[PDB]
Ligand code: FES
Ligand SMILES: [K+]
């Protein structure tokens with residue numbers, strides 16, 4: 012289990028890592044399923060583009076937003 | 087070695103002191119410590135315990151207002167929990183969103 | 186009185202009574218049947 | 224305190240995480256000019 | 264005719280806490296507007312004395328007032344005498360009123376300025392580790408850069424609407 | 425008539441939100457003590473031929489009785505009153521720093 | 525407050541006198557309230573080395589009430605130090621011997637186990653009856669609310685309250701009762 | 702250590718003790734006690 | 740009186756450890772996380 | 783209810799029985815489908831030892847319990863009320879339901895000890911001389927386990943062992 | 945019958961004198977919480 016945690020880049024706790032949802036990866040995740048939390052990455056505004064690469068933020072809901080204004084919502 | 091390890095205890099003890107002082111101030115207004123800290127967070131007031139303890143000593147009128155605000159938010163929680171969703175959100179329960 | 190973990194009535198006249206926080210078997214006809222809860 | 228509540232609003236469990244409290248500039252020059260970006 | 268849920272009064276028929284009836288939201292919205300207008304007029308007419316503010320700076324919060332000193336535990340990349348604005352104000356308080364950010368007050372509402380007055384280093388901090396019976400001992404001395412700031416002024420503007 | 429806290433001891437708290445809802449305004453004027461709730465300050469406290477004299481009945485007490493009197497007067501234990509040795513007396517900083 | 529420095533310091537660190545009524549109250553709840561006040565934990569300026577504890581006056585300690593069968597079951601153990609000096613007495617026996625011991629012992633055990641404890645105990649004034657010395661009475665500032673609400677006896681209910689409670693069943697008319 | 706089968710009830714590892722505690726049978730509770738209905 | 744033979748938490752006779760309410764809640768909290776992990780690994 | 787009078791006149795004894803006024807159940811119970819007095823008024827889990835107004839309706843003039851066949855209570859509620867009355871007597875909340883004393887009997891002065899939530903009879907309980915270790919502590923019972931299901935308005939459950 | 949100032953003290957005489965000082969500070973505009981001196985560059 013120690014070895015697989017290193018392979019998945021999960022050495023530091025509470026640090027989200029993105030992995031492909033494929034059988035091979037899932038096979039590793041299942042060995043250490045009791046040590047981790049798995050959530051789906053959600054893309055409400057689609058994938059980041061080259062223009063907005065630097066303005067992304069991963070929220071606690073799992074949604075990766077491509078605009079991060081740090082402003083209140085006028086709505 | 088003692089001086090080195092004492093740096094951990096200083097931070098720990100400092101925070102135990104603030105909680106004791108905040109608890110005392112809250113009880114003067116009929117509020118328990120967890121109700122004040124918990125409900126202030128729900129109002130998006132991010133004042134830390136160090137500042138709260140200082141306010142209790144040197145800004146007692148502001149602290150009563152903070153205690154009143156926490157108490158108001160606490161009562162709104164109860165009304166919401168009692169309701170079946172018919173009621174609109176409390177005036178002080180509305181959360182300011184940041185996008 | 187003989188101490189007993191399990192109290193049993195030994196005749197029809199035996200009667201179970203709880204006194205001073207413990208069960209007793211009392212018998213007027215045969216006082217030898219008297220038992221105390223242990 | 225409040226970690227679970229913050230998560231329910233789509234915020235970081237710890238208020239030191241993402242958001243205006245942490246990410247916004249701490250200070251600026253009194254004349255208006257913005258400060259160099261913070262190292263963190 | 265008793266109601267379907269009527270319970271005769273007993274020690275456990277109802278909860279110990281008193282019943283609380285919150286104000287009507289429509290009526291309270293009008294009362295809130297009155298309170299805000301009253302406090303705004305106090306600002307316009309200057310009916311306040313010394314102000315204090317809670318400002319987030321260098322990861323931590325400082326309750327500050329004019330003429331104060333605060334010791335920042337790091338270098339701020341500012342020359343001595345340079346004046347700066349503290350942009351993260353959680354609270355500004357007066358004798359008769361207090362304004363609370365959610366979590367931060369708008370920059371239009373309050374302006375806190377400060378001046379760098381000293382750039383120095385802390386006294387030496389001993390770092391020593393020791394484990395008995397293991398020939399394990401090490402001593403390190405660290406001095407941390409510090410910056411002293413003077414709070415020059417806390418000013419509020421009548422921008423409560 | 426709803427009030428989050430009683431308003432009769434320290435200040436009259438009024439909580440309000442701005443129209444945008446981003447600022448909490450707290451109006452808290454001080455409550456003055458009513459005159460009715462005060463007491464009057466107790467100002468009220470022969471043919472002697474001989475001038476009155478101020479006689480100081482010092483009546484110096486022994487250590488034990490003296491310590492008993494002091495401990496009772498200030499509601500403390502006896503221990504605080506006993507002396508300390510030179511080692512401790514000379515370690516005390518007689519010019520301590522003063523914050524303000 | 526615009527007070528001179530010395531009067532300001534005097535006011536903040538002053539000793540308040542509290543009155544507590546022990547009648548029908550469990551000693552533990554009385555002790556919990558007294559412990560906070562004697563230590564100063566009810567003050568926002570509290571610090572262990574500030575010596576900011578207050579005075580607590582507890583009256584009617586003879587009329588304290590234990591829940592359950594603690595009168596019979598709770599034992600206070602002491603040892604004279606001599607061989608055979610171990611002594612164990614029930615709460616009932618101790619109460620009849622010393623009408624303040626129970627409240628005193630509950631408080632003593634709740635205070636911090638340090639050298640300040642016996643100093644705090646000097647600021648505790650226990651009286652078995654309503655009588656309080658005149659000097660102690662003149663310095664009192666505030667009475668603390670009794671921690672336990674005393675239940676009303678059936679003879680203390682007003683006829684309005686009795687009438688308000690419905691009759692729940694109809695007894696047989698020919699029952700002797 | 703002791704063998705897997707003992708004459709006494711062997712003490713469990715604390716994690717197993719917790720496992721047992723969390724997986725105890727919980728009986729279905731009716732909204733209204735059936736004795737309170739016709 | 741009330742001695743535990745030998746060392747407390749080893750051997751044949753041990754000090755009994757009891758499961759507190761919050762110890763139970765802690766375990767159930769992590770059981771819920773793992774149950775969800777199962778779901779997201781199913782697709 | 784029915785009273786009985788024994789009058790001896792002219793060296794002759796005449797035993798009679800008269801029917802006195804009988805109280806009636808209050809009209810319109812909120813839960814007519816209830817099968818016992820308690821659940822007919824939605825009182826299940828909502829009464830305690832100090833609710834003398836409730837308890838006093840099910841006891842005899844001298845403090846004794848009434849039969850379950852007469853009151854109509856169910857076994858569960860009858861047992862709860864029976865224990866509650868014992869605690870009410872021991873707490874001193876029923877001063878007008880004292881035992882009948884034969885003529886010429888005046889109880890001696892006994893030490894007054896205020897108590898409440900007393901499960902056992904004071905005389906039948908022994909001192910806890912040996913408390914035991916923390917992991918095997920002998921506890922002092924408070925209240926009754928029969929009332930464990932009472933409505934709890936606090937987040938902590940009732941502690942029945944102190 | 946309107947409160948102008950209040951002062952603490954260890955004696956009634958000391959408390960009264962302090963109350964007079966508090967009243968004088970309020971009358972003259974030298975209250976502890978008065979507006980701080982403005983050191984900003986004159987406009
Ligand atoms: S029938 Fe409802 S509680 Fe007895
Ligand atoms: K062992």
Ligand SMILES: [Mg+2]
Nearest residue numbers: 702703704705
């Ligand atoms: Mg083995």
Ligand SMILES: [Mg+2]
Nearest residue numbers: 744745746747
């Ligand atoms: Mg051992």
Ligand SMILES: [Zn+2]
Nearest residue numbers: 196199212218
């Ligand atoms: Zn027999």
